Amino acid sequence: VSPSYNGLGLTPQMGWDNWNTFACDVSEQLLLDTADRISDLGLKDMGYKYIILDDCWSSGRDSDGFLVADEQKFPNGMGHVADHLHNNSFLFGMYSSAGEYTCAGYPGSLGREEEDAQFFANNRVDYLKYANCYNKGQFGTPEISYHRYKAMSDALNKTGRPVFYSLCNWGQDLTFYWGSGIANSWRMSGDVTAEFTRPDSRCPCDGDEYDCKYAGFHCSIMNILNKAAPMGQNAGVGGWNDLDNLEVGVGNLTDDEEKAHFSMWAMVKSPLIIGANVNNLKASSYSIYSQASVIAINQDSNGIPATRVWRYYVSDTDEYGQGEIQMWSGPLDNGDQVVALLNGGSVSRPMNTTLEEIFFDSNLGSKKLTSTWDIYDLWANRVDNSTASAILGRNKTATGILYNATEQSYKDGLSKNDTRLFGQKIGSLSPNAILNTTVPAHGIAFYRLRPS
Amino acid sequence: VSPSYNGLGLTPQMGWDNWNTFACDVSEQLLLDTADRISDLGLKDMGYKYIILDDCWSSGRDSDGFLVADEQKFPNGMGHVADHLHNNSFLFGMYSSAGEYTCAGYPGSLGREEEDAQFFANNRVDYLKYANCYNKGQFGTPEISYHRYKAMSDALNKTGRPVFYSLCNWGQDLTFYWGSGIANSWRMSGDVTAEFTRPDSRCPCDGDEYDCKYAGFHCSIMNILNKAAPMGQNAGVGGWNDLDNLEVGVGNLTDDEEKAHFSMWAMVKSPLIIGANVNNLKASSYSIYSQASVIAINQDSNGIPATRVWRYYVSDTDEYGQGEIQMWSGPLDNGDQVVALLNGGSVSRPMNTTLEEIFFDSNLGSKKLTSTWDIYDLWANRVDNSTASAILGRNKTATGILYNATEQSYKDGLSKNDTRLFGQKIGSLSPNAILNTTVPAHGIAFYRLRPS
Amino acid sequence: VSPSYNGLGLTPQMGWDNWNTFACDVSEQLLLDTADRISDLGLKDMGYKYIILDDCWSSGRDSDGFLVADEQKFPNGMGHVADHLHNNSFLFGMYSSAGEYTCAGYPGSLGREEEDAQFFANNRVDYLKYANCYNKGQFGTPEISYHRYKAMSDALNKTGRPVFYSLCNWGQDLTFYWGSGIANSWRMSGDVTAEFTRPDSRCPCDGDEYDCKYAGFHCSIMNILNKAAPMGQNAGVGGWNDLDNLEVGVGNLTDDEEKAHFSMWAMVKSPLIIGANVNNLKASSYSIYSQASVIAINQDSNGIPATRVWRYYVSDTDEYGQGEIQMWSGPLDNGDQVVALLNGGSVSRPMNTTLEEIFFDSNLGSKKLTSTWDIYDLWANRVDNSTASAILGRNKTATGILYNATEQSYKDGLSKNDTRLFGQKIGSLSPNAILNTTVPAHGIAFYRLRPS
Amino acid sequence: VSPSYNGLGLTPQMGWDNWNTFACDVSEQLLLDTADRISDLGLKDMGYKYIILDDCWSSGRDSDGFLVADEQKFPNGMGHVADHLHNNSFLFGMYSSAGEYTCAGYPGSLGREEEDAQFFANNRVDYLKYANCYNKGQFGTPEISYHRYKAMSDALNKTGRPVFYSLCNWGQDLTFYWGSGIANSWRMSGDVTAEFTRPDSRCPCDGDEYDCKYAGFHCSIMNILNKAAPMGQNAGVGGWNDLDNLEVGVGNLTDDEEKAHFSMWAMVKSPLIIGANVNNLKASSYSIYSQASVIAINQDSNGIPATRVWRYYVSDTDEYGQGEIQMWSGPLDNGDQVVALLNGGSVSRPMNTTLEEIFFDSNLGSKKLTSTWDIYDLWANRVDNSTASAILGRNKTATGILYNATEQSYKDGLSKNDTRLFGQKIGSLSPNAILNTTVPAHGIAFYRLRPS
Ligand SMILES: OC[C@H]1O[C@H](OC[C@H]2O[C@H](O[C@]3(CO)O[C@H](CO)[C@@H](O)[C@@H]3O)[C@H](O)[C@@H](O)[C@@H]2O)[C@H](O)[C@@H](O)[C@H]1O
Ligand SMILES: OC[C@H]1O[C@H](OC[C@H]2O[C@H](O[C@]3(CO)O[C@H](CO)[C@@H](O)[C@@H]3O)[C@H](O)[C@@H](O)[C@@H]2O)[C@H](O)[C@@H](O)[C@H]1O
Ligand SMILES: OC[C@H]1O[C@H](OC[C@H]2O[C@H](O[C@]3(CO)O[C@H](CO)[C@@H](O)[C@@H]3O)[C@H](O)[C@@H](O)[C@@H]2O)[C@H](O)[C@@H](O)[C@H]1O
Ligand SMILES: OC[C@H]1O[C@H](OC[C@H]2O[C@H](O[C@]3(CO)O[C@H](CO)[C@@H](O)[C@@H]3O)[C@H](O)[C@@H](O)[C@@H]2O)[C@H](O)[C@@H](O)[C@H]1O
Ligand SMILES: *[C@H]1O[C@H](CO)[C@@H](O)[C@H](O[C@@H]2O[C@H](CO)[C@@H](O)[C@H](O)[C@H]2NC(C)=O)[C@H]1NC(C)=O
Ligand SMILES: *[C@H]1O[C@H](CO)[C@@H](O)[C@H](O[C@@H]2O[C@H](CO)[C@@H](O)[C@H](O)[C@H]2NC(C)=O)[C@H]1NC(C)=O
Ligand SMILES: *[C@@H]1O[C@H](CO)[C@@H](O)[C@H](O)[C@H]1NC(C)=O
Ligand SMILES: *[C@@H]1O[C@H](CO)[C@@H](O)[C@H](O)[C@H]1NC(C)=O
Ligand SMILES: *[C@@H]1O[C@H](CO)[C@@H](O)[C@H](O)[C@H]1NC(C)=O
């Protein structure tokens, strides 16, 4: 633990990014309509405050060296978009790269940090995603990468405007070590894709290679989670490990895969950023994004990422030869404990654990191991497929259905003991007893344990 | 994507180099005769414009510190060779090393970049191959290697002469990351040899070791292709991965090995540089170099290297214990798709793929997966062994037989739909159907798919 | 061998640290009571001189930039604690980090080395544990880490006060190479835990990965010993490999595990620092800490760490799939030899060795291989469970029971031949004969061999 | 190839070092007696010119900062020893470390390069072995190690005295790349030991790990040879890979192991430095050192290290689980070829090769593959055990028995075709025929092939 370097990111950020679906194809209308839609679906009031505009937004640089927004896509300027967003209680996020160009080939900020930082402040920006493309060889050791990213960190501070600073260097040069003191969140891997396990030649580093020299992209959900496992210890209040935007609602993942993906991202205190097209979001995906129970885990005050307790490879492998089972446990602020039984195998299986395994750093005969604990299924009481369809199809309102965090912070709700945030009690676990369930293929059992 | 740093290399370079056969043994006559021969065989007009003179060309340095060409080998100077080449519509390329000496022990350019750059400009040079021998410990991190190669990059720019800058550092210190902003192409491995699979003690890094600390040489064709697989994502217009000169016509590769080698080099957008002795070139090798269909893939406008979709090891291993099968797919500018089924096994085998595998980043129900595609064998209509022999034996002319890119750029030919550039339609692939062929040992099936 | 850079640490340091049990929860009273208790139990006079106060002791920094001790925990200041300790013949140790903050988030010493060094001298400090948290990207190569730690090394020297300088960078950037010239001891791994073999996701580097890029913590006893194995050759008089505080009396290790852990730590010349709560220490653990025989090995004059002679994996694996057997041998100053037969297997087993294996660098027919050697069980004559309980329960005094090193240095005792420091002779080993024993699961046979 | 940076080391150096047997225990008498003995046994006139004094020779530094020789060991100074050596036609070599201290703890030369260099010149030194102990963190990248060793390289040059500069950094930071331009030879691994295959915990890097981060020591003969295999390509006239002093006559290697060890060291163009006590040298070891045939390979003009053609692991493993077979081939200056069939297996076995395998870089139908070659056993006509005993026991003189290179350089002898230097013709190898022999366990078949 250390204080937030800039007072922001006391919990992981939440919001939305246009990349995963719209890529370069962007506009003022797309952004604002989507913003409205996110607000209308009640996701904004769940915490999804950040509207993040990605790459391909500028047209070039003007006479003063300052950045110029592509007026075809943005005919009123950027600050105009910020204002619309602020008026609807959103926060506004923009994109750049710590290099000559951005990953799509547009002007980059390397050596031009102050001008660009000021441009973002001038256009009333709250959040900067800062990439790693075309960095002119300014990487390869922790020090050199640290200074390149400190440049913009300092540049933003100089503008006097509070800006949530999001590093996007894919974990290059061991970012988990040096991120906290200059940033609020750092990407720790190459880009995620809508694949749960699939290895990819574009993502050469496997799950064990947290110190990757070619981060790449099209990395699977399990590849990134596996890379993040040891990094939890270097995350905390004010500085988080970023496992990339959520793929829930994107591509062709199963409901089980989407739950597992969303739960784990929340349990390791990763930024929860919607990658889906909210105007073309399916019901099952929508109810996953809106699971207040799980969001509460991610938004835990004085957040601590969960720890992977064990991992075994299984003979039940998928079409890609992948198959492993995992257990994760983690402390919660109010004395509770998160537990995940993760079945990455190709077949439905029984999974089990004990109190000894759950409270991994507790000695024999200690309170936690000698007490009885109530088990809450965090996935219970999820918005059903019919209700979600109705809300998405504008027939119903989200009001009264989805938990409102604007009305009542997650911390408050936990203090008040909202069944809304704790899921449903399905039983209890006692010393010398075993917790057992059936966990679907590529699925999860996700519990919150409370003392009896 | 980013713009070409110097406006050159909008497609991968094509041409010829004396090293693979003649090594140090060089002369004005060898160069000029070969140039004429390349022109006469019609290869020049296919795109093979660059005549690259390699090592062992200088005799020392003169009183002014400037380089001096070995007058026994070059009695008229270098600019005299340039002129002959320009007159015959060739472009002229020379060699140096970012070190104290060249790999053969001749004067090197380290710390003497401006003088040497100017010398090349003064002798009207269009292309520089810039090696990595005797670099005085100026390597080991990306930064230090970047600055060493930037030195000459800057030095060439200062001369005001357009020069195609070809890096030859064998991928040391992760060149794929930093090459684009200062160069047009970069060697990404140690030297190739006329072996398809053979591991070599002089090339200690295997196919998976793209981050190699001892690049070495005598690396097999499959060793280099395997190293290049993840690097595709860091190549594009103006900056290419260089998998070293072609070994087609050199050594004792089979026809199938030569086709596979040539196709893959083209599909990953590698420089296509003839390493063969064109005055002693055999028929089968000649027809491979002259396959307009395959060159069109390499010379695709807005070029994107193909992606390796899958790779499996097989029990059919050769004399060296090597045996793997690969599938590669890649987007083409006009909406087409390149597909390669690569049999690196020791035995002829059936190979298969689907549309789902071919369009690897396409969601279910999307156009590409729901449409029907016509399959074109890119190796059809190749110059036969009799015709090629006749052309090489001067009995026939290449004119009217080989596609003339000078007369009609590859892009135009693709727009005009020249059967010359598309191969022969052998069928079509529909959703839920499987594409199946028989692929020879160490051979390839190489397709272009067009929408129906 | 090289002289001690500062004249201290001629043998490995011994003492106690509050972290392993009390963590942040500390006070003047806790420290002083514990000090008294350590003295009363006779451990002080065995060599456990250093009372090391860990993290969470400061409240902030004062107006002059100097450090300020948290007056709630320390209402008389630090020098007041030093004095009480000096008066009772203890030495006083404090904590800081070569970073912006300490690992618990309190003021760190990076860039503020002189002020902080002076503060420690002013408060009459004898020992500094200097951590690696929040180091602002000042790591990644040996050189950069070396200078960061040299900064404080120099800063302490400037104060003119003798200070035992203990590095705590977890072996990052190959500390064993550069530690000796600027420090007395260096942590060579991430934090130990009360687990003998258990792999942990928070400690990603296994036993073979001595060059670890994410040191982590919760590393098992065998994980750290395995990492230390090759490092012996870079330790000696004045500069030692530090395998972290002893876990004897902490958590739930078996008696056999505690003996193995304690013996090995001693045999490799690691600092012997009590991590146990001495006010809640159990009998068996107490008798282990008080084994004069084993301490004599650690405190050997002109100390040389032992060498691991062999290591095999066995099918007798524990609940964590871990199971290996090891033999270690090491020269002693008086011509004797330490031998350890280490059974990390899950089952009791016979273990054997010869003189050829014991004297691993001795040629055939040399004196050591041709002589006969007496075998001394170093674990014989250990304080029994009844006597220790009595001493801990204040019924008996340690005086007359525990060896007094203050009264008679270990070297003297070895010269005088105290059966107290040599254990019990259990037999002899002759050329061509085999030394065989039964070694318990997770246990050790620990011998001193003397010439007949 | 590149010229020798200083004109020395046109062939690998030959001589003797006191370390392998006498370690720190040294004197003027030991050195001079040994020198006389080496001369009397006729080894000096075989090329063993360099008498290298190792560590533990100085007593401290004098008032001027200059080095002071330990007058108990050297009561006449060092130049006095040089003179005795020059008078007997020897060359004199001394030791230092690019660090604060030497490996035994005596004054080191880091930051004091000029004074020390001048001290060596003043005492008429011809050769410097320059170690890597206590280097104050000045390693970790190629550049930093390069400059540290360039310091002394420059310092020696400044003295104007020709000095053979021998690097001893154990291959740290890829020395094979940067050694040539500043040195004559570089250690490429940790210290050798009298073990043929034995893995050792003090030498953690295996045979494949040429890029070692903890070089260590007590590395086996096969461990070092395996590390050196890829490095041949970076050695040549003026700059050689050093595989450490010869262990022939030291410890308890078999005659077959000693032959294999000596042959391979010669074939890869390593320095041939006697590590044995020449006053206690056994017959079989003596005849190995004196095999003119094999020395001629090492001392080949325009020397090129041999290439390992293939390597397979065998089921015939020794007590340490080690067992591999190797074939090495290499070009010789006069057009001949060295061939080694190396049996690292535990059992005697038949080994075979063809001309295609021997001439690994020759195409089918080329002269070398189509010609017939005469096979010469390089180990034939070796001094027998009786004659060697007599010479060592002073009964006979070496004169007329051992080849005299002082009288006739190896190059001359090869030109004159001395059966003395070629071994005995045992047959011939023709195209499509197989060369087969029986090779002993841990033994070698070592051939020179000549065209018929
Ligand atoms: O472009 C915005 C992108 O930046 C970050 O990217 C990492 C990724 O960038 C490139 O990927 C893409 C494919 O999505 O490839 C082309 C450029 O050739 C671009 O259209 C696009 O960015 C590189 O090709 C990859 O090497 C690199 O891994 C960021 O992580 C993304 O979220 C996104 O914001
Ligand atoms: O010399 C021209 C050569 O430079 C580059 O070199 C890498 C390669 O150089 C040396 O190998 C040599 C140089 O003459 O190449 C032949 C092999 O056919 C050998 O006779 C000789 O050793 C170094 O010795 C090697 O370590 C190194 O791998 C460039 O990459 C080549 O394309 C070529 O232009
Ligand atoms: O001492 C001369 C030695 O220097 C080089 O060795 C590296 C090696 O040195 C140390 O080994 C020895 C044992 O031989 O250990 C003691 C004290 O530690 C010394 O007397 C002696 O040098 C280190 O312990 C090792 O870690 C280190 O690797 C050189 O390589 C040798 O050839 C020789 O010249
Ligand atoms: O706080 C003093 C501590 O510093 C060293 O620890 C390394 C260890 O620090 C961090 O862990 C901490 C502190 O131990 O433990 C909890 C749980 O994470 C946090 O409050 C705090 O950050 C890092 O998280 C770990 O990655 C790192 O390994 C030292 O080694 C200890 O002996 C102790 O003095
Ligand atoms: C994944 O593939 C499924 C087929 O199993 C397909 O249904 C999804 O595409 C969506 O189909 C919907 C038809 O009910 C359509 O209304 C929706 O717009 C479409 N989504 C997109 C992005 O084209 C596929 N899912 C996704 C997210 O692509
Ligand atoms: C290795 O062990 C052999 C027995 O296998 C032994 O003979 C060697 O010792 C040497 O023996 C010589 C007579 O054969 C004797 O003259 C010599 O003094 C002796 N060397 C030493 C150091 O004692 C052993 N060889 C070595 C080199 O130690
Ligand atoms: C600027 O930096 C200081 C810390 O030096 C911090 O307290 C402050 O909040 C930062 N301000 C902004 C606007 O980022
Ligand atoms: C003393 O107690 C320990 C338990 O901590 C036990 O394991 C050990 O065997 C006892 N000692 C003896 C000699 O039995
Ligand atoms: C010479 O003696 C050695 C003993 O070490 C033995 O290996 C070898 O076989 C002997 N030579 C002959 C020719 O018998």
mmCIF file of C-alpha atoms in Angstrom, chain D residues 311-425:
data_model
loop_
_atom_site.group_PDB
_atom_site.id
_atom_site.type_symbol
_atom_site.label_atom_id
_atom_site.label_comp_id
_atom_site.label_asym_id
_atom_site.label_seq_id
_atom_site.Cartn_x
_atom_site.Cartn_y
_atom_site.Cartn_z
ATOM 1 C CA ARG D 311 24.602 -34.012 -31.496
ATOM 2 C CA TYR D 312 22.350 -36.801 -30.201
ATOM 3 C CA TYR D 313 21.539 -37.932 -26.684
ATOM 4 C CA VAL D 314 22.020 -41.633 -26.009
ATOM 5 C CA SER D 315 20.559 -44.074 -23.471
ATOM 6 C CA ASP D 316 24.090 -45.055 -22.394
ATOM 7 C CA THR D 317 24.325 -42.543 -19.548
ATOM 8 C CA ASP D 318 26.924 -42.283 -16.785
ATOM 9 C CA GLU D 319 26.595 -42.029 -12.986
ATOM 10 C CA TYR D 320 25.353 -38.461 -13.512
ATOM 11 C CA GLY D 321 22.684 -39.218 -16.158
ATOM 12 C CA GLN D 322 24.812 -37.620 -18.876
ATOM 13 C CA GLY D 323 25.305 -39.205 -22.288
ATOM 14 C CA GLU D 324 25.554 -37.633 -25.728
ATOM 15 C CA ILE D 325 27.400 -38.248 -29.000
ATOM 16 C CA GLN D 326 28.885 -35.512 -31.186
ATOM 17 C CA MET D 327 30.498 -34.995 -34.587
ATOM 18 C CA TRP D 328 32.639 -31.992 -35.383
ATOM 19 C CA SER D 329 34.185 -30.959 -38.677
ATOM 20 C CA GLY D 330 36.457 -28.045 -39.556
ATOM 21 C CA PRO D 331 38.484 -26.620 -42.463
ATOM 22 C CA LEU D 332 42.291 -26.534 -42.326
ATOM 23 C CA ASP D 333 44.545 -23.946 -43.990
ATOM 24 C CA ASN D 334 46.216 -26.335 -46.472
ATOM 25 C CA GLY D 335 42.847 -27.675 -47.716
ATOM 26 C CA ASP D 336 42.654 -30.541 -45.211
ATOM 27 C CA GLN D 337 39.733 -31.199 -42.842
ATOM 28 C CA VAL D 338 39.600 -32.002 -39.108
ATOM 29 C CA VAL D 339 36.989 -34.555 -38.048
ATOM 30 C CA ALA D 340 36.022 -35.554 -34.512
ATOM 31 C CA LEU D 341 33.682 -38.375 -33.532
ATOM 32 C CA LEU D 342 33.013 -37.719 -29.868
ATOM 33 C CA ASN D 343 31.488 -40.440 -27.679
ATOM 34 C CA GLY D 344 30.217 -38.821 -24.476
ATOM 35 C CA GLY D 345 28.196 -41.964 -23.785
ATOM 36 C CA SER D 346 29.041 -44.301 -20.902
ATOM 37 C CA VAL D 347 29.760 -47.284 -23.140
ATOM 38 C CA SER D 348 32.077 -48.030 -26.055
ATOM 39 C CA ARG D 349 30.147 -47.625 -29.327
ATOM 40 C CA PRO D 350 30.462 -47.705 -33.120
ATOM 41 C CA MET D 351 30.319 -44.213 -34.625
ATOM 42 C CA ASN D 352 29.924 -43.340 -38.300
ATOM 43 C CA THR D 353 29.896 -40.421 -40.753
ATOM 44 C CA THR D 354 29.931 -39.700 -44.499
ATOM 45 C CA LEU D 355 31.610 -37.145 -46.749
ATOM 46 C CA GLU D 356 28.277 -35.319 -47.009
ATOM 47 C CA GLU D 357 28.259 -34.888 -43.208
ATOM 48 C CA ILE D 358 31.967 -34.012 -43.038
ATOM 49 C CA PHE D 359 31.747 -31.370 -45.747
ATOM 50 C CA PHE D 360 28.586 -29.858 -44.297
ATOM 51 C CA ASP D 361 28.615 -26.679 -46.386
ATOM 52 C CA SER D 362 29.434 -28.417 -49.685
ATOM 53 C CA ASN D 363 26.821 -28.961 -52.403
ATOM 54 C CA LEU D 364 26.172 -32.304 -54.091
ATOM 55 C CA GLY D 365 28.583 -32.982 -56.986
ATOM 56 C CA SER D 366 31.127 -30.400 -55.764
ATOM 57 C CA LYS D 367 34.834 -31.379 -55.716
ATOM 58 C CA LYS D 368 35.028 -32.151 -51.976
ATOM 59 C CA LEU D 369 32.032 -34.513 -52.131
ATOM 60 C CA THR D 370 33.162 -36.177 -55.375
ATOM 61 C CA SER D 371 36.853 -36.603 -54.447
ATOM 62 C CA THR D 372 38.428 -39.363 -52.349
ATOM 63 C CA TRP D 373 40.044 -38.422 -49.047
ATOM 64 C CA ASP D 374 42.846 -40.054 -47.073
ATOM 65 C CA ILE D 375 42.126 -40.582 -43.356
ATOM 66 C CA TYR D 376 44.856 -39.849 -40.813
ATOM 67 C CA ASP D 377 44.536 -40.873 -37.165
ATOM 68 C CA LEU D 378 45.907 -37.845 -35.313
ATOM 69 C CA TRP D 379 46.476 -39.899 -32.160
ATOM 70 C CA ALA D 380 48.807 -42.417 -33.802
ATOM 71 C CA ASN D 381 52.521 -42.451 -32.930
ATOM 72 C CA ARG D 382 51.964 -40.915 -29.508
ATOM 73 C CA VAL D 383 54.841 -41.170 -27.028
ATOM 74 C CA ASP D 384 54.276 -44.479 -25.210
ATOM 75 C CA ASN D 385 53.910 -44.823 -21.433
ATOM 76 C CA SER D 386 57.474 -46.197 -21.027
ATOM 77 C CA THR D 387 59.249 -43.450 -22.961
ATOM 78 C CA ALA D 388 57.208 -40.689 -21.274
ATOM 79 C CA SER D 389 57.968 -42.144 -17.820
ATOM 80 C CA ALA D 390 61.683 -42.170 -18.686
ATOM 81 C CA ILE D 391 61.628 -38.520 -19.848
ATOM 82 C CA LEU D 392 59.654 -37.393 -16.776
ATOM 83 C CA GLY D 393 61.984 -39.435 -14.543
ATOM 84 C CA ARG D 394 64.942 -37.634 -16.203
ATOM 85 C CA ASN D 395 66.428 -40.897 -17.603
ATOM 86 C CA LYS D 396 65.831 -39.776 -21.223
ATOM 87 C CA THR D 397 65.791 -36.412 -22.994
ATOM 88 C CA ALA D 398 62.800 -35.134 -24.946
ATOM 89 C CA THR D 399 65.203 -33.985 -27.692
ATOM 90 C CA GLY D 400 64.753 -36.169 -30.779
ATOM 91 C CA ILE D 401 61.491 -37.559 -29.371
ATOM 92 C CA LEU D 402 59.186 -34.507 -29.174
ATOM 93 C CA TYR D 403 58.598 -32.268 -32.207
ATOM 94 C CA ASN D 404 60.495 -28.978 -31.942
ATOM 95 C CA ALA D 405 58.366 -26.052 -33.104
ATOM 96 C CA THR D 406 61.136 -23.559 -32.266
ATOM 97 C CA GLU D 407 63.306 -25.399 -34.798
ATOM 98 C CA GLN D 408 60.494 -25.714 -37.349
ATOM 99 C CA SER D 409 57.160 -23.897 -37.092
ATOM 100 C CA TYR D 410 54.012 -26.003 -37.407
ATOM 101 C CA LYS D 411 53.197 -24.299 -40.734
ATOM 102 C CA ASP D 412 56.595 -25.359 -42.145
ATOM 103 C CA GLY D 413 56.173 -28.928 -40.901
ATOM 104 C CA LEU D 414 52.784 -29.090 -42.610
ATOM 105 C CA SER D 415 54.335 -27.762 -45.858
ATOM 106 C CA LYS D 416 57.206 -30.305 -45.571
ATOM 107 C CA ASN D 417 54.575 -32.945 -44.834
ATOM 108 C CA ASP D 418 56.066 -34.250 -41.586
ATOM 109 C CA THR D 419 54.384 -37.549 -40.653
ATOM 110 C CA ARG D 420 55.072 -36.100 -37.204
ATOM 111 C CA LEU D 421 52.262 -33.571 -37.677
ATOM 112 C CA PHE D 422 49.755 -35.603 -39.696
ATOM 113 C CA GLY D 423 49.560 -38.787 -37.633
ATOM 114 C CA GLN D 424 49.279 -42.090 -39.476
ATOM 115 C CA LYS D 425 47.262 -42.831 -42.609
#
